[PDB]
Swiss-Prot record:
Residues in Peptidase A1 domain copies: 17-328
Protease in keyword set: yes
UniProt protein name: Endothiapepsin
Name of the gene this protein is made from: EAPA
An annotated Gene Ontology molecular function: aspartic-type endopeptidase activity
GO biological process: proteolysis
Residue ranges that the Swiss-Prot or TrEMBL entry lists as coiled coil: none
EC number(s) recorded for this UniProt protein: 3.4.23.22
Similarity remark: Belongs to the peptidase A1 family.
Cysteines joined through disulfide linkages: 255-290
Keywords on record: Aspartyl protease, Disulfide bond, Hydrolase, Protease, Signal, Zymogen
Length: 330
């Protein structure tokens, strides 16, 4: 089997991407944030505290003939931005782009933090990291990909995120029309439950490539590119008027400035992030100060190749017995 679904930016800045997902019988379609940095599929639901729902589409398991309570199961998650959610668990039929999993754990939110409430466009998350990070207790649950894997033509999914435009998540096949050149594959460590790999270096604009190992994770659920302070300082030093602002919480720059590209290494191959991808707009409405799309990972404890990086590539998440990551230009 295979599946193919379009993923769409939630706003004009590509702050996140949503993908429609069919849950239950008859189908209830919710727009979920596909997140290769976590491993829970959770949704706004008929059980979510009413004051914490504001515009989201909810899953109502009582209206699904295939929903079954996963008795005694609870879940609780917090994300790197300090947001959180928790609740109980149903199993149900879940389809993505024509690919169906029966008995998928669907984690129903009883509580969500304010940032979730305040974002009407995201109805929940669909985790695509390794199932060892799944928070369901007492019995940890599998991701949608893990459950689908054996049925797939090939044990892979691909992320093809758009810049200010829709893109595609495919399951079970590699669309050879969707990228240029070849796909370069690189080793993955699953020891922390992430798609963790090592970039071979970087360049800023037309500058010379610096060979240096940069461990990090491929995370579709993180918006920006978070890299070591040394790397990030070298980038923003090439932007007239850029500065790191403690009050704003990162590097900012005047949007009269031209942003250089940023290149990262994948083995001997190179992925180029165009300068425009690194502009996340005014820090507040009407401001001439713009927020940068490349920021320091110092304090996070890990480097994160988020959407800013990933949307410059066609990315293969290879879930073979020994997982690997592939990157192609597009």
């Amino acid at each position: 089997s295979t599946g193919s679904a379009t993923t769409t930016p939630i706003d004009s800045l590509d702050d996140a991407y949503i993908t429609p997902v069919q849950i239950g019988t008859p189908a209830q379609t919710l727009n979920l944030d596909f997140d290769t940095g976590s491993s829970d599929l959770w949704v706004f639901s008929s059980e979510t505290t009413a004051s914490e729902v504001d515009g989201q589409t909810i899953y109502t398991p009582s209206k699904s003939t295939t929903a079954k309570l996963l008795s005694g199961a609870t879940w609780s998650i917090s994300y790197g931005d300090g947001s959180s959610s928790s609740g109980d668990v149903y199993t149900d039929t879940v389809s993505v782009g024509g690919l169906t999993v029966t008995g998928q754990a669907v984690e129903s939110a009883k509580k969500v933090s304010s940032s979730f409430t305040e974002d009407s466009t995201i109805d929940g998350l669909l985790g695509l990291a390794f199932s060892t990070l799944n928070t369901v207790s007492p019995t940890q649950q599998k991701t949608f990909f893990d459950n689908a894997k054996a049925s797939l033509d090939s044990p892979v999914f691909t992320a093809d995120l758009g810049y200010h435009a829709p893109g595609t998540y495919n399951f079970g096949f590699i669309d050879t029309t969707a990228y240029t050149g070849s796909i370069t594959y690189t080793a993955v460590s699953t020891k922390q439950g992430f798609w963790e790999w090592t970039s071979t270096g970087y360049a800023v604009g037309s500058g010379t490539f610096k060979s240096t190992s940069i461990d990090g994770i491929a995370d579709t659920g993180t918006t920006l590119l978070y890299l070591p302070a040394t790397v990030v300082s070298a980038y923003w030093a090439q932007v007239s008027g850029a500065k790191s602002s403690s009050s704003v919480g990162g590097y900012v720059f005047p949007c009269s400035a031209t942003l250089p590209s940023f290149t990262f290494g994948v083995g001997s191959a190179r992925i180029v992030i165009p300068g425009d991808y690194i502009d996340f707009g005014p820090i507040s409405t009407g401001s001439s100060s713009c927020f940068g799309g490349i920021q320091s990972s110092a304090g996070i404890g890990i480097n994160i190749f988020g959407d800013v990086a990933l949307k410059a590539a066609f990315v293969v998440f290879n879930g073979a017995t020994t997982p690997t990551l592939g990157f192609a230009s597009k």
